[PDB]
Design a protein around this ligand. Sequence first.
Ligand SMILES: Nc1ncnc2c1ncn2[C@@H]1O[C@H](COP(=O)(O)OP(=O)(O)OP(=O)(O)O)[C@@H](O)[C@H]1O
Ligand SMILES: [Ca+2]
Ligand SMILES: [Mg+2]
Lengths: 125, 372
Amino acid sequence: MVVEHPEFLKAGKEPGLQIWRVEKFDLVPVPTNLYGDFFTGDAYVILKTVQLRNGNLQYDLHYWLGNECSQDESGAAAIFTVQLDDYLNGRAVQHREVQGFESATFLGYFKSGLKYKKGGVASGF
Amino acid sequence: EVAALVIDNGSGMCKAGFAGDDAPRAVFPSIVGRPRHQGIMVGMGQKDSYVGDEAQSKRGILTLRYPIEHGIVTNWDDMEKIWHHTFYNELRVAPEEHPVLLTEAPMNPKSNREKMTQIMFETFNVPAFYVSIQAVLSLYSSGRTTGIVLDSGDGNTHVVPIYAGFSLPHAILRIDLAGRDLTDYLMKILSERGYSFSTTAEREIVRDIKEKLCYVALDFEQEMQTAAQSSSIEKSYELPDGQVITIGNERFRAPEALFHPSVLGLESAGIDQTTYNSIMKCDVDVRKELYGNIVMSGGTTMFPGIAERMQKEITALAPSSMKVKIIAPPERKYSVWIGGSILASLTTFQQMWISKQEYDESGPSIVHHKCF
Ligand SMILES: Nc1ncnc2c1ncn2[C@@H]1O[C@H](COP(=O)(O)OP(=O)(O)OP(=O)(O)O)[C@@H](O)[C@H]1O
Ligand SMILES: [Ca+2]
Ligand SMILES: [Mg+2]
């Protein structure tokens, strides 16, 4: 809510999927053409926005933790998820998605499955 | 821009550093030493105060005091002294030049919080300030927004249920035994073995023995008799005077007090039972995640075998259908600090700080809702 970030301004505006990656204490958008590609060394924040019959928007916030992501990344993804939720007035359900234990719902967002990628952006520490 | 400073004032150990670092640069005892009667010459006691390691070292001529009891400040003048030392001597920076993130214990009085806020803006003139609940910083550092944190340090053991980023105050429970109590208990049973540890130096030996050889028995019985028969559980400890001494079941009997406080003549539930009680005080819907996200933080949760035993004890209390998981990261001694370093470095947090400007217009009372 007091948060002033260009990505928070874009989050949950229209129905669809939005993916951001944690890059050294910042929340950086992932190119829409790369959605589904996940660096096992990084952490990401995923927002699924759905339009309800009554006009409201329904949110599902998934923070995905790659097997080799550093503490600052997994830590940041969690906090960003709580901040995004708060910013969206808390109409979102938060889901922690660990590489290899992803929810069927989260997997359901990707028609061609997930593409794991070794590596990622360096820790912010 | 500038690095925010992050300080976790523990009742026993203070952790200080710069946001963005992976660990606290300075970790020292939360002690303030003053000469009984001062002097001038080197080693005669020139300064009028010492803090941390130095105070500890020269305790021969100073009277040490601990401004923090159970995570609550009980001597604000001495507290200010530790803060001064922390900025200028430990981190070696001018406070007025850096936003400062401090931590607080659960159930910290609103007056202490406001007083802490006042000193930071008025005495140290910080440009930005924030206070965070310790348990929550530890949860974030573990990469979760929901879980129940068991924080056992030197002064207080609390269990703090947190759902989607917010702790549930109504379910927060405290166990009135912690690290110092275990050190004192181990010093006892060690005296029954036929020793004597009574001075400060000797108690530090016990602390070391506690932190180096103690463990938590998966089955307190199987171990007790295991130590009674085979001398396989035995461990030898080399002392300052050089002579070696052997530690037996005192190793697992000291930390056992965490599960059965009655051993310290204390009538309180143990850490396992208290975690279950806290979870039960929470809404049905959240209990499941809490059970699968029991996070350990603090130095007293460092006992090898503690996670293994908590798992067992808790699965025994939880419904059969329940997935019980205990998370005890190797670095849980700095979990709180690390959570703060991450939090304070986020681009998004920069609007979260209480500004000197707003302090000026609304005073210390704004701290509560600002850092909700
Ligand atoms: N490996 C270890 N095994 C057991 N105990 C340990 C270990 N390392 C440190 N401790 C103990 O942990 C305590 C210090 O813990 P910690 O830094 O978490 O507390 P604190 O922040 O100062 O206390 P509180 O949160 O109550 O204010 C001391 O009693 C110390 O002996
Ligand atoms: Ca990475
Ligand atoms: Mg502590």
